[PDB]
Amino acid sequence: VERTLHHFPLDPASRQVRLALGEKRLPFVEMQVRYWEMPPEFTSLNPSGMPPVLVETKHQRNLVICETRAILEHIEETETEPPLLGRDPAERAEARRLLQWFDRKFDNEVNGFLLHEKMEKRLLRMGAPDLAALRQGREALRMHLGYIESLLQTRDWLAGRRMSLADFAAAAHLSVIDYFGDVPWKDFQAAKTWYMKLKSRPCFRPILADRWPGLAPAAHYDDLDF
């Protein structure tokens, strides 16, 4: 199968797909999309206008898989090597719960403040961050970090004994916040240790190489020691 991933580098959803494909050693070509500019041609691929979109081609027939709910389940169903969902129903349920936790709750309570006020406003030339919005995002982030810390002191990985899509979801989201220097790793020891381990995996390497014009990452962003 040929794979083309239409994505935006600093998008957590996109990064989850890049981590899953990398971890499964599935090659893909990438096409970067400035989706906020609503390029007509991308909206013809995905009517929501949002990345990521994975196009799988086999014998010149295309399967256009849009956004993470469809993409991640497709990957896990069709490429078992290695599994990013556990075998026990409880581990599968817990990982999926955590996918939803990050894609909805974390995205709303943290990203809607920290990523909106800094990255999105910059890209749309809408001016400076609202400092109160930033303070609200930072406090929400600390509450989410505390939650994952409590999990990681009781489990090896977020969803239990096996590394899963839940780890990649949390790490994808945190990696973008980390690019903008906003994660207080020093205060959450189990979470710091967990991220350091994820960040050193081969699948993470391209993500650490991400750079976008006008958006200069924190100095430690691509350091394996931080």
Numbering used by the authors: 3 to 228
What does the article say, verbatim?
FzlA is an essential FtsZ‐binding protein conserved across α‐proteobacteria. Depletion of FzlA leads to cell filamentation, but leaves Z‐ring and divisome assembly unperturbed, suggesting that FzlA is required for active constriction. In vitro, FzlA not only binds to FtsZ, but promotes formation of stable, double‐stranded helices containing two highly curved FtsZ protofilaments. Importantly, FzlA appears to play a key role in determining cell constriction rate through its interaction with FtsZ.
To this end, we expressed an N‐terminal hexahistidine‐tagged version of C. crescentus fzlA in E. coli. Subsequent data processing, phasing, model building and refinement produced an electron density map at 2 Å and the corresponding model was of very good quality. Based on sequence homology, FzlA was classified as a member of the GST protein family in C. crescentus. FzlA does not bind glutathione, however, and lacks the catalytic histidine and serine/cysteine residues found in other GST proteins, suggesting that it no longer retains glutathione transferase activity. Residues 212–228 at the C‐terminus do not show any secondary structure, but are still ordered. Mutation of one set of residues (D109 and E122 [FzlAWB1]) weakens interaction with FtsZ, while perturbation of others (W38, R124 [FzlANB1] and E119 [FzlANB2]) completely eliminates binding. In addition, we identified residues (P131, L136, R137 [FzlANH1], R140, E141 [FzlANH2] and R144 [FzlANH3]) that when mutated, retained some ability to bind but were no longer able to curve FtsZ filaments. Satisfyingly, these residues map to the same face on FzlA's surface.
